[model samples]
Target chain A: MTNIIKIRASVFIPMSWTEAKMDMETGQVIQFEGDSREFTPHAVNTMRSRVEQEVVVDFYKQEVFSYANTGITTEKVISPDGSVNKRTGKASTENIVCTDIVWNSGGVQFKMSASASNPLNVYAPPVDYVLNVCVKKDGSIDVQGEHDGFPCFEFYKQVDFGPFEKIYTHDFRETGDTAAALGGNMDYSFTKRL
Target chain B: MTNIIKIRASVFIPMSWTEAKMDMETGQVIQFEGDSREFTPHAVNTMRSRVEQEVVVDFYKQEVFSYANTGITTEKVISPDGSVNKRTGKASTENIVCTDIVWNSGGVQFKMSASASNPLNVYAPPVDYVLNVCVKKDGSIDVQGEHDGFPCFEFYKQVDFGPFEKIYTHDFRETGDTAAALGGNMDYSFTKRL
Candidate 1:
């Protein structure tokens, strides 16, 4: 069955634009574009960069994807020993970097699932960080970032949202309790080397 | 205070060697060495490379350290605007590449806290993988790997650890239900570009 879906939306809280068109049957990313960033002027160098992940999905795997999306498909594979190997597809990954901080998502079930903080010095201790997002069975969203360093220099804010909002943006970076989106002039293009 | 501690251990499960010495008083790594590897012949390339984080920790931040570790300290900072900013020290980051699967730790509170799956193709979905470890509120260790991909090629196995097992190792990659460490030889030297 050939199934295709298109979705376009912008999240204001995090300030990201995600555009996508997917072919579910063959897992082809027909068209996909995304832009996201975070800038915290007051924070340390590692904390200055931010994360944005925008995805486009499909079911059929593409030989060469210029664009892509989220989709899962079950199929069979034959091993060299003449064995039938059954498998299901996992979505591709996407990387969005803010300065040195890296935000990458392993598409499909692992949506928006990875990140890295830059190491200013090889000899200094590292700063561990975590971004946890949970949508409970009751549909309530819980999202938070855990910075294992000084709380005062922490930039990410706890986000709250109403279920009915069509598009939402979460302010990811700011000064102490300043509620700033780390506002400044910066834009990233949704382009890949292919 | 010129306090330095040295420790070394070998884990057989994931097959890694970790060695380090840290000056806790000023947060400096005297000598650090680590080697880790994983090869899952059956699993996809993204899941083949494994993770091993060997750390050396300390307190004071180093200006240009050749080696390092984990530590935290309170200090004062003067911003460009001449504002006094109080801050605490965080550890430096480390990058250990297991093939295309990049595993890096944010250091300190973000110990062994980051990773990225190699995108086989730009268009296909990227596999999302997670390695979560909790010392737990009660000190009972809980560690697991969350793979958002197919369970069949799931190379990592659920680790069963005895509470008293010192410097234990967990198999990071294998094929099927087979209890294989994906045994192979790999050694990574702890050298930097300087």
Candidate 2:
């Protein structure tokens, strides 16, 4: 039988310019195969908390900033016209969603997405079931949950930010040449419960 | 003395379609404020775990489709004379950065910009330190580091998706009433390392 337990969660996915880790020792950049690292640092840091509670740090999507600059290196994979291209270049979109998740903390999933389609789900297989709840007797503390089933949560999503069409336009201006003198805005919001 | 730590982090702000919790009891939506739930709810569900994880469950982002869509709203506000209009609404770039960090899990503070005034900088703080090695002793983990100074870490960025030109142009014959879908693609390999 499934238990009817209530949980509250919230998460943030900053729209700032960010990068992956690299090895200065080898001059090679580090690429994370899974979407987990994006939230690994936060998990490690949150573990430092005094509560020593089981915290769910979900790995959310990634947003990238790309553009079409005035440079060409490779031959265009032409559309079968067999004609030389007039305008040869790539057009860019400055926004892309990378990683995402819904996590648990203090008996609640703070980063869970509130949609039925992507509901917060934690699998409790027998062996894994032992890792399910981290509750303490007398409300002391109980911490345990699976890392694989983290729900994909996002940032403030309601009033503050609109939709894809909306965010794209706002971010585009910031990527172009004129961005030196002028900058654009990005406002988004999300909801959470305790 | 202040001890500088190198952290691997990703930042992001929420989008409209991104699911979030709310207190039906309180009209105000949930806030990622200090140390707790922004609002109280009469009944909480397990939807909590979905907060900040990767965008895997629903690759289409349709589950929380609004975040991408919200991004479009912001873009509209910043367009030239609203060229992008509602889809590409524009604002100050810093606001975009705030939206990112404020919403998702905490982001790492890197101290480098693509250029002296890469507009993306306005959206976030510069990344400074970096982490290299991690050793586990007993139950605790010891982390080592590499690269120091202002611009010590590297960030990888790309421009991948879009319904580019806010005002999509369509040919009545091809896509019916809906304008043709125009998108931009800016791919990135690895730029630099600290």
- Which candidate gets the maximum DockQ versus the true structure? 1
**Is model 1 an incorrect, acceptable, medium or high docking prediction?**
incorrect
Give a tens-digit lDDT track for model 1, residues A1-194. 22221112222222231222222222322211212333332222221123223222232331111222232222343344456544443323243211222122322211223232212111112222333332222222333433322112212211122112222222333422221111111211121110
Model 1's chain B yields a TM-score of 0.23
Interface RMSD value for candidate 1, one decimal? 23.6
Write one digit per residue (lDDT tens) for candidate 2, span A72-117: 1112222334342222222121211112322343322222212111
List residue ranges in candidate 1 displaced over 4 A: A1-74, A79-194, B5-54, B59-110, B119-166, B172-194
Regions of model 2 farther than 4 Å from truth: A1-106, A112-186, A190-194, B1-194
For every candidate, how close is chain A to the native chain A in TM-score? 0.23, 0.17
Candidate 1 positional error at B128, Å: 8.3
